[PDB]
C-alpha cells in the first residue's frame, strides 16, 4: 500500500523552506516532493517497503529544532467527507465555561478544574456539574456578553470548514460546552450542524445545572456514528480534531484523528498530532493545495 508523509508549518511562522523540504525527502529516500503551500506544507511520497514508523523518526530527526509537524498515512482515502470538530480551545481560543466563571468571580477555581478534566484526570460529567453549579444565579445576559467580548476564532477554522464544504463534506461542531455558544460559533465559522450540552435557566437566571444526560466522551463517538450513518458513510470517512481527553473517543474511531495542540496526556495517546500548525493543517493532511482553498 502506498504511503505519503506530509510536513506542516504554521502559516504565521512558515519555516518549511525549499532547502528544508529537499533535505527531508532525501532523508526518506523519497521519489518526488510536492508543495501544497510554499514555506508551509509539502507532500513526500515514501518509497514502497518503508514502515511509517521509520519515515516518522527519520523526518523528525532531520527536522529537529524546527516548528514543523510530521504525519504519515496511506495516500488513498486521505480526503475525508465528514469533519467532526471539538469547539473549546480548538475552533475558538477560549474555554466558554472558564469565561462564564469569570462573571462569577471564580475564573481561576473553575479553570483549574477544566485543566484537570481536559487532561483526563477527572471524568467529564462530574467535572461539568461541579463547574456549572458555581454559575448559579448568573443573569442570562452574560452569555451574549462573553460571546461578543471575549470569544475569538482559531486561525484557519473558517478556511478549513469552507474548503471542506466546497468539496462536498458534511461538517459538525460537537462540544461538551453549551448550545448557546455553539449555535453562534457554528454559524460564524460555517458548520452544517452543531451538538452540545444545555444550560438550564428559570427564564431570567442560570439554575446552575445542565440538562441530563450529559454529553461527554462517549457522546462524541455516538454523534460521529449517527452522522456517518445518516449521510450514508462510515466513520472511516471522517476526520476528527480535538485537544482534550473527551475528544479521544472520536479521534480514535475516525479514519483520521488529530490531536491539535493537545493536552500532554492526550497527545501522548493520539496516533497523529499537530503541535505547530493551525487548523489549515487539517487541509494539508487531506492533501489539499492552497489553490483549492476557499479564500
Q: What are the residues binding Ca ion (CB under 5 A)?
A: 86, 88-89, 243-244
Nearest alpha carbon to residue 182 among 92, 291, 76, 284: 92
- Would residue 201 show up in a list of annotated catalytic residues for this protein? no
For residues 231 and 170, the answer to whether their CB atoms sit within 8 Å is: yes
Q: Which three cell numbers stand for residue 243?
A: 485537544
The single residue listed with the C-alpha cell 452540545 is 196
Helices 52-62, 18-27: inter-axial angle, 10-degree rounding: 140
**Residue 207 touches Cl ion, criterion: CB under 5 A:** no
Q: Which does 86 bind (CB under 5 to 8 A by kind): Ca ion, Cl ion, none?
A: Ca ion
Q: How near is the Cβ of 244 to Ca ion at its closest, in Å?
A: 4
Q: Which three cell numbers stand for residue 209?
A: 445545572
Which residues face 210 on adjacent strands? 199
Nearer to Cl ion, 116 or 184 (CB): 184
Q: How near is the Cβ of 20 to Ca ion at its closest, in Å?
A: 31
Residue 10: C-alpha distances to residues 4, 54, 274, 276, 286 (Å) = 20, 24, 10, 6, 16
Q: Which does 199 bind (CB under 5 to 8 A by kind): Ca ion, Cl ion, none?
A: Cl ion
Q: How near is the Cβ of 265 to Cl ion at its closest, in Å?
A: 13
3 state SS of 174: strand
- Would residue 86 show up in a list of annotated catalytic residues for this protein? yes
Nearer to Cl ion, 8 or 20 (CB): 8
DSSP 8-state secondary structure symbol assigned to residue 261: S
What is the distance between the alpha carbons of residues 196 and 86, in angstroms, rounded to a whole number? Answer: 10
Say which of 43, 56, 64, 86 is annotated catalytic.
86
Q: How near is the Cβ of 136 to Cl ion at its closest, in Å?
A: 15
Distance of CA 138 to the CA centre of its chain: 30
**Residue 178 touches Cl ion, criterion: CB under 5 A:** yes
What is the distance between the alpha carbons of residues 288 and 78, in angstroms, rounded to a whole number? Answer: 10
Q: Which does 256 bind (CB under 5 to 8 A by kind): Ca ion, Cl ion, none?
A: none
Q: Name the binding residues for Mg(2+).
A: 86, 88, 243, 247
Q: Which three cell numbers stand for residue 5?
A: 508523509
Q: How near is the Cβ of 226 to Ca ion at its closest, in Å?
A: 20
Residue from the set 44, 46, 70, 199 that interacts with Cl ion by CB under 5 A: 199
**Residue 245 touches Cl ion, criterion: CB under 5 A:** no
Residue from the set 154, 257, 266, 290 that interacts with Cl ion by CB under 5 A: 257
Q: Which of residues 264-283 bind Cl ion (CB under 5 A)?
A: 270-271
Positions that interact with Cl ion (CB under 5 A): 178-180, 198-199, 252, 257, 270-271
Q: Among all residues, which ones are annotated catalytic? A: 86, 88
Amino acid at each position: 500500500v502506498s504511503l505519503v508523509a506530509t510536513l506542516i508549518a504554521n502559516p504565521a511562522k512558515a519555516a518549511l523552506a525549499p532547502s528544508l523540504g529537499i533535505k527531508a525527502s532525501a532523508a526518506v529516500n523519497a521519489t518526488g516532493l510536492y508543495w501544497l503551500a510554499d514555506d508551509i506544507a509539502c507532500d513526500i511520497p515514501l518509497p514502497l517497503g518503508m514502515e511509517a514508523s521509520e519515515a516518522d523518526a527519520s523526518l523528525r530527526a532531520t527536522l529537529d529544532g524546527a516548528p514543523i509537524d510530521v504525519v504519515v498515512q496511506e495516500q488513498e482515502r486521505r480526503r475525508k467527507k465528514i469533519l467532526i470538530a471539538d469547539m473549546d480551545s480548538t475552533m475558538i481560543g477560549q474555554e466558554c465555561i472558564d469565561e462564564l466563571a469569570e462573571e462569577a468571580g471564580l475564573r481561576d477555581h473553575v479553570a483549574a478544574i477544566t485543566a484537570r478534566a481536559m487532561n483526563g484526570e477527572i471524568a467529564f460529567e462530574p467535572a461539568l456539574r461541579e463547574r456549572v453549579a458555581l454559575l448559579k444565579g448568573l443573569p442570562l445576559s452574560v452569555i451574549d456578553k462573553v460571546i461578543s467580548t471575549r470569544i475569538t476564532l482559531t486561525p484557519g477554522g473558517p478556511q478549513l470548514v469552507r474548503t471542506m464544504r466546497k468539496h462536498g463534506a458534511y461538517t459538525a461542531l460537537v462540544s461538551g460546552g453549551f448550545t448557546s455558544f455553539t449555535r453562534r460559533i457554528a454559524e460564524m465559522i460555517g458548520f452544517n450542524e452543531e451538538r452540545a450540552n444545555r444550560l438550564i435557566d428559570d427564564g431570567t437566571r442560570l439554575t446552575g445545572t445542565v440538562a441530563e444526560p450529559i454529553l461527554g466522551r462517549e457522546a462524541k463517538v455516538e454523534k460521529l456514528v449517527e452522522i456517518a450513518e445518516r449521510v450514508g458513510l462510515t466513520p472511516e470517512d471522517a476526520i476528527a480534531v480535538g485537544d482534550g481527553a473527551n475528544d479521544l473517543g472520536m479521534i480514535q474511531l475516525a479514519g483520521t484523528g488529530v490531536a491539535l495542540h493537545a493536552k500532554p496526556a492526550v497527545a501522548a495517546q493520539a496516533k497523529m498530532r499537530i503541535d505547530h500548525g493551525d487548523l489549515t493543517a487539517l487541509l494539508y493532511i487531506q492533501g489539499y493545495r492552497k489553490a483549492d482553498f476557499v479564500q
